[PDB]
């Protein structure tokens, strides 16, 4: 669980979770300079999510009592954001694959 975007709006680790996790740096092999098209944020959730569930449904986030009908502008902010990474960052910004 912990805090942050991980396990709150991203994939949530269940309570009393059993299993291993392996993380490794991904400087190359489908990680090039500039902002790649994929690999975007999953934020702006009204709930705290549930263990083991996958959220595939994307929708305009609600920032007010009245919800918009498909127009972007005041409120109705985007719940996603691309990762502005690059293979020329430091140690804390390089892409990392977690399985």
């Amino acid at each position, epitope marked *: 669980g912990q805090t942050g975007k991980i396990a709150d709006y991203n994939y949530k680790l269940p309570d009393d979770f059993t299993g291993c996790v392996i993380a490794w740096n991904s400087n190359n092999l489908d990680s090039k300079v500039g902002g790649n098209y994929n690999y975007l944020y999953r934020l*702006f*959730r*009204k709930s705290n999510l549930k263990p083991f569930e996958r959220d595939i449904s994307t929708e305009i986030y609600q*920032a007010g*009592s009245t919800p918009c009908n498909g127009v972007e*502008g*005041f409120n109705c*902010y985007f719940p*996603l954001q691309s990762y502005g990474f690059q293979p020329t960052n430091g140690v804390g910004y390089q892409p990392y694959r977690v399985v």
Partner: antibody
Amino acid sequence: MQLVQSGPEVKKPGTSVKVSCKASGFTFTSSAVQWVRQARGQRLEWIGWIVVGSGNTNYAQKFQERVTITRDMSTSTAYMELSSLRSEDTAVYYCAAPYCSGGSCFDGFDIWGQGTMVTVSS
Amino acid sequence: EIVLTQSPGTLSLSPGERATLSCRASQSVSSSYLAWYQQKPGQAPRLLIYGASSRATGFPDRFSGSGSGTDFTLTISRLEPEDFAVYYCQQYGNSPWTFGQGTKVEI
């Protein structure tokens, strides 16, 4: 409930302007940030809107160039820097953020700052 | 997009006013996306009505108005004398989120 703005700054006419705004009393993760232009004996002009969670901003007919934002997600902040200052850049910028906690919140802008006093001079 | 030019100008009446204000729009704007900020001389502005369909949680009472997209009306029923300041219309939905011209008042 408490939004604070940095002190007024004296700069050079044409280098850059950057004003620090900090918030406390409500969740900054899921909220919005906007910027204002006001002057004595003058009307109000909305500059732009900044989403701290997801980088997205749009400018009016004046701010397409010489303006860029910075997330500054640490310490619950967000910056905007302006370049190529002109003579008529003496204004109070102000800054605000809606009171949001839970996922859905109020529509209007309730918590406001105190602004700065930047006089573009020598 | 900006042709508002709100009808009222400078009002100078004793407390007990029954006048009304109006915000004009170039095109019909969908409801629940309007605002009327209450700016103050030497103080940060506030907000009283949002979307012209409800009120905020806690704010002075005795005034509430609403209107159509072309002409958003608002009425005041004996507001307190200290609330004599500048009102700024504001439209939402379509960027840029431009404000209103502003209105002046007198005791």
